[PDB]
């Protein structure tokens, strides 16, 4: 399936890139935080810049977890929507159930028709034979 196959390839590429980016970001944050002397740049500014970088990295990792939550959502949707096997079985089951229900209903209806018809016969034998004579 070119379309679906290309989509699977893109999903694999996204997972690999996100995992690599998260690991690299974590390693960079760890060394930077382990800590280093300031030369020319100076703590005031260098420290504030490091704080901003750490906050940005945390925001990137928090939303890299949201992207994976979205990936889990897509996994569930495709397992439910693109699983034709499951669909075949479900359709078959609902169909059998509905058909049996309909048939049972019909049997009941016919027997009723039958009972109502017998009552109608009795009434047709009556009303017609009534003396009355306006």
């Amino acid at each position: 399936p070119q379309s679906k196959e290309t989509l699977l390839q893109s999903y694999n590429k996204r997972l690999k890139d996100d995992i690599k980016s998260i690991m690299d970001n974590f390693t960079e944050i760890i060394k930077t935080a382990k800590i280093e002397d300031e030369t020319q740049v100076s703590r005031a500014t260098q420290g504030e810049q490091d704080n901003y970088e750490m906050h940005v990295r945390a925001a990137n990792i928090v939303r890299a977890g949201e992207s994976l939550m979205k990936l889990v959502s897509d996994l569930k949707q495709f397992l439910i929507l693109n699983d034709f096997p499951s669909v075949n079985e479900a359709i078959d089951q609902r169909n059998q159930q509905l058909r049996t229900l309909q048939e049972e209903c019909d049997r009941k209806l016919i027997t009723l028709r039958d009972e109502i018809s017998i009552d109608l016969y009795e009434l047709e034998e009556e009303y017609y034979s009534s003396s009355s004579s306006l």
Binding site: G65, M69, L81, A90
Partner: protein, 59 residues
């Protein structure tokens, strides 16, 4: 993380019932379904494509 855990501990059951009646298909990001009898041999030129949106879901 705690926000994700609060959003972790019904959409799926609903979509499952939807599968039970509509057999939907995948295109782009606007997943669609069939709302015509074209499967049961009806030659009516009309697109019975109902959308599914996240709002636990709306049709």
């Amino acid at each position: 993380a705690e926000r994700l855990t609060k959003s972790v501990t019904d959409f799926n059951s609903e979509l499952l019932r939807l599968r039970q009646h509509w057999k939907l298909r995948k295109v782009g990001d606007k997943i669609l379904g069939d709302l015509s009898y074209r499967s049961a041999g009806s030659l009516f030129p009309h697109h019975g494509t109902f959308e599914v949106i996240k709002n636990p879901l709306d049709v």
